[PDB]
């Protein structure tokens, strides 16, 4: 698709069996999901935002489907207000910014 | 141009006569620049995301140039970690997400 930016660029994702809404976010290095119980090994990490830092759980090699596109990547789980798909996964789905 | 997302999507902007680098951020509703002097009236505002909120100065109807494209719109100034071009200006320059 070509997604205009008059509204937030929200898409449906599927992760750990669950459907969720998430924001396609060119301003995020990483993909950050709201608190959820995901199985698997994880490592603690601190990530920065506009207001300061949050602690997240880093899960590697996680299958995730973004607006119909299958991907496998790192997912961070922690207290973000909104699920965000960052550049690590945007690149896997072939996303570009055009103007 | 069509900008891939292997690296942060940083572009040159001109604001208030000065040249700066900024991040094209589809995950931001609005545009916020690092502390600087700008001419004009402003009002205080809170903005936020990961990590909570910061207090900014909101300037309305400010001319800005983004990678060679002129736009006019609301520019926020405050202690953001990086200069951020949000949707309010991305739309002005015809920016879309494509995959």
């Amino acid at each position: 698709p070509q997604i205009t930016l008059w509204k937030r660029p929200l898409v449906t994702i599927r992760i750990g069996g669950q459907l969720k809404e998430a924001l396609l976010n060119t301003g995020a290095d990483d993909t950050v999901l709201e608190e959820m119980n995901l199985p698997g090994k994880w490592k603690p990490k601190m990530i920065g935002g506009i207001g300061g830092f949050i602690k997240v759980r880093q899960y590697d090699q996680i299958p995730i489907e973004i607006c119909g596109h299958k991907a496998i990547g790192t997912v961070l789980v922690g207290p973000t207000p909104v699920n965000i798909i960052g550049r690590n996964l945007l690149t896997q789905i072939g996303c570009t910014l055009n103007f | 141009p069509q900008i891939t997302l292997w690296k942060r999507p940083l572009v040159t902007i001109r604001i208030g006569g000065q040249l700066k680098e900024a991040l094209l951020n589809t995950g931001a509703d609005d545009t916020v620049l690092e502390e600087m002097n700008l001419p004009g009236k402003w009002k205080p505002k809170m903005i936020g995301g990961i990590g909570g909120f910061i207090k900014v100065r909101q300037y309305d109807q400010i001319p800005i140039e983004i990678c060679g494209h002129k736009a006019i719109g609301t520019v926020l100034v405050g202690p953001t970690p990086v200069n951020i071009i949000g949707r309010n200006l991305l739309t002005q320059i015809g920016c879309t997400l494509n995959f």
Binding site: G27, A28, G49, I50, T80 | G27, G49, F53, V82
Partner: peptide
């Protein structure tokens, strides 16, 4: 609501 979801890996 919050509206600026800039995110950085340290």
């Amino acid at each position: 609501r919050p509206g600026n979801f800039f995110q950085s890996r340290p």
